[PDB]
Design a protein around this ligand. Structure first.
Ligand SMILES: CC(=O)N[C@@H]1[C@@H](O[C@@H]2OC(C(=O)O)=C[C@H](O)[C@H]2O)[C@@H](O)[C@@H](COS(=O)(=O)O)O[C@H]1O
Length: 722
């Protein structure tokens, strides 16, 4: 029956598919249409048309595997999209209409109904499938009776009757929050509209409002921009994605129901965008350190994942007004145009999303100015993101502590992320494809960049762990300078190291001290493991003399510097060792398959060439110290290392500090409360992290105690001499 409920469903259809905006003369849209045409065509030619079939699609036949249910229903949603698209060859096609109706009935009688119990993954039974069912019925509501719709959605009410909890029919339900809570809306709000159930709609919207509250513990968004999910995992880039992506779709519909959400409550959305999401986006790429186990998915590499956030932002901009709308449009525009590697349209899956992106990009009224420099210390999730606009490089520092899990391996995904948070670092430069094109299934998991580890074998069956120490954190001074440390202990408590980082605007110093090993395994710190481009080869220099790297590891004793020279300076990487160090390097083709790190992925062999730089630690009390200097040519790197000749102030078991004379900035990490005199100019008095700047006779201080997660009054930690 046509009423206010169907009106809302019409708006929903315009959002999830957008057929009403389709334009055959629009190349980007025609491209998505053809994709859907192909998908439906394939589904129609492989579906079982035999009586007494045991499945609809052979490749999704074993229904004891919950994933097959969601995949099956999603195939029906694709059909519903095309049968209602005037420009589709399947528009109002009698066979497709009957196929969708008959398929819904079959699955309802033999595979998914209220008389069933969760078998496999609860996610499919409560989120994946219900969403596919809602969208199918919503798109084809003019081909189904209200009774049939209520019939096919009853099962949704059986598995998800409570808008505040998930796994309600199991022996271990959980409180819905963040991304899941948004999906709860895409389940119960839509089902509610389909069932014309006001109570379900009102109660679900009320439950959804919890998402707008910032937290100070648990899952959710924090004031410092961090986003935690799954109890204690940094997850802005995956579950955070689902949250903004899904919520931006729902809001236009929710705000037109009899239970609209207060404007002041939704105000936090803008905080997420500016404080939580934006910093993790560099040249169109969403930083992998925030994507959890999703890094092990071939179809979700960095630039692809970024689009989920960008399209969410764009939708929010569209429902916003004036300056707020104007600036969000500019944010999306500048990020997209800075991405010369990935075509944003490849992940805009609805015509309205394509339309919005096109108008934004062609509207001269929307400014597209390169983003300025920034540095976000996401202490509540132990990650740090840095971007230098003048030089054009991004830097990501992935850590963990007693407050966060190192890596997430579940549902057979991300089997080898063991060391992705053990002081791992990311460098975002001219090569936007670096962490893409199969980086994850080909990178050597035992040598993640920046990490200090023993070479003991690791089991894929292992799961994440929290760190024994709480002494992990970043002290930020300004948009270009910050200091961080990690009181590191490896997975089996056989190795330790005081690892610290000194972010000094256009370079980052890496210092490690108190390195100890109690095992029989060899210990080493991976200085880098950079994925190469066959089109842009690097010329390697050691102590400024060209070197020839081979697959076989070569040792370089008494090394003062290493320089990776590209034809594009924005891809150059230099390493300056404060004190001559013994390192080894090699360039080798590494092979692997996505299935190796994610059971549900392809076993197709992938290959990439990598340049690995390492420093062995054969004695207790060992250390390392070097400055990472990117985006400068060879002569400029050589000049810079001369300026930094005496930048290392100290690197021992209780004190680590680097000084940038040009800036007048000090980065300092103290492991105890002894009085530390620095450069005969001042004293720092407490255990913690410092970033200090001298401006004449003045001193600007940024102190952070990572264990108590508090700063402190200046006189408690700093004292000027004389
Ligand atoms: C945040 C996350 O990893 N969520 C998991 C699901 O993944 C998301 O799926 C969708 C969607 O519209 O369904 C959008 C996102 O890009 C993607 O991250 C999914 O993996 C389900 C079930 O698993 S599967 O059978 O292995 O595919 O589990 C969620 O936790």
């Amino acid at each position: 029956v046509k009423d206010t409920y169907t009106d809302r469903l019409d708006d929903w259809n315009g959002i999830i598919a957008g057929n009403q905006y389709y334009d055959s003369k629009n190349d980007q849209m025609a491209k998505l249409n053809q994709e859907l045409e192909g998908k439906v065509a394939d589904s129609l030619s492989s579906i079982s048309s035999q009586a007494d079939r045991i499945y609809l699609w052979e490749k999704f036949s074993n229904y004891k595997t919950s994933a097959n249910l969601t995949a099956t229903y999603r195939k029906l949603e694709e059909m519903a999209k095309q049968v209602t698209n005037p420009s589709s060859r399947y528009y109002q096609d009698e066979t497709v209409v009957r196929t969708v109706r008959d398929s819904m009935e079959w699955m309802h009688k033999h595979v998914y109904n209220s008389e069933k119990s969760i078998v496999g993954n609860w996610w499919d039974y409560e989120i994946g499938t219900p969403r596919a069912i809602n969208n199918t019925l919503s798109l084809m509501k003019e081909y189904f009776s209200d009774e049939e719709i209520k019939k096919y959605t009853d099962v949704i009410e059986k598995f998800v009757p409570d808008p505040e909890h998930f796994r309600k029919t199991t022996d271990n339900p959980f409180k819905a929050l963040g991304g899941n809570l948004v999906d709860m809306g895409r389940v119960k709000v839509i089902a509610g509209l389909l069932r014309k159930d006001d109570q379900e709609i009102s109660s679900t919207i009320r439950s959804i409002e919890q998402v707008f509250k910032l937290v100070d513990q648990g899952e959710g968004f924090y004031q410092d921009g961090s986003y935690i999910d799954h109890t204690n995992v940094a997850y802005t880039g995956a579950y955070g994605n689902v949250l903004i992506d899904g919520l931006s779709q729902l809001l236009p519909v929710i705000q037109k129901t009899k239970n609209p959400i207060d404007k002041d409550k939704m105000q936090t959305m803008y905080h997420w965008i500016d404080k939580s999401f934006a910093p993790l986006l560099v040249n169109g790429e969403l930083m992998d350190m925030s994507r959890g186990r999703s890094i092990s998915r071939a179809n979700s590499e960095g630039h692809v994942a970024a689009v989920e956030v960008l399209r969410g932002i764009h939708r929010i901009a569209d429902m916003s007004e004036g300056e707020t709308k104007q600036r969000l449009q500019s944010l999306v525009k500048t990020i997209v145009q800075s991405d010369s590697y990935y075509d944003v349209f490849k992940n805009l899956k609805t015509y309205k999303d394509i339309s919005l992106m096109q108008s934004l990009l062609s509207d001269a009224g929307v400014a597209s100015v390169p983003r300025t420099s920034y540095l976000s210390a996401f202490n509540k999730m132990d990650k740090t993101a840095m971007y230098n606009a003048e030089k054009g490089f991004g830097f990501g520092l992935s850590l963990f502590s007693s407050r966060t899990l190192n890596y997430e391996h579940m549902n057979k995904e991300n089997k080898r992320g063991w060391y992705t948070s053990d002081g791992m670092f990311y460098l975002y430069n001219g090569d936007l494809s670096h962490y893409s094109d199969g980086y994850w299934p080909t990178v050597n998991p035992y040598k993640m960049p920046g990490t200090t580890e023993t070479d003991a074998k690791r089991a894929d069956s292992d799961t994440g762990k929290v760190l024994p120490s709480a002494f992990v954190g970043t002290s930020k001074l300004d948009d270009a300078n910050a200091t961080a440390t990690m009181d590191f202990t490896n997975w089996n408590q056989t190795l330790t190291a005081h690892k610290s980082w000194f972010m000094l605007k256009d370079k980052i110093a890496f210092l490690g001290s108190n390195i100890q090993n109690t095992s029989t395994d060899t210990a080493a710190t991976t200085i880098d493991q950079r994925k190469l481009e066959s089109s842009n080869p690097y010329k390697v220099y050691v102590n400024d003399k060209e070197a020839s790297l081979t697959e076989q590891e070569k040792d370089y004793p008494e090394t003062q510097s290493v320089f990776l020279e590209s034809s594009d300076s924005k891809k150059n990487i230099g390493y300056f060792f404060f004190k001559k160090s013994s390192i080894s390097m090699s360039k080798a083709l590494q092979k692997g398959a996505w299935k190796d790190i994610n059971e549900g992925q392809s076993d197709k062999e992938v290959e990439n060439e990598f340049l690995t730089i390492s420093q062995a630690h054969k004695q207790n009390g060992d250390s390392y110290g070097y400055m990472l200097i990117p985006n400068v040519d060879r002569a400029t790197f050589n000049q810079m290392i001369k300026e930094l000749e005496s930048s290392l102030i100290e690197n021992n078991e209780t004190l680590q500090s680097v000084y940038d004379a040009k800036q007048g900035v000090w980065g300092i990490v103290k492991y105890d409360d002894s009085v530390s005199t620095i450069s005969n100019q001042f004293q720092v008095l407490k255990r913690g992290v410092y970033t200090i700047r001298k401006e004449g006779d003045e001193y600007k201080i940024a102190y952070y105690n990572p264990e108590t997660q508090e700063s402190a009054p200046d006189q408690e930690v700093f004292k000027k001499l004389e």
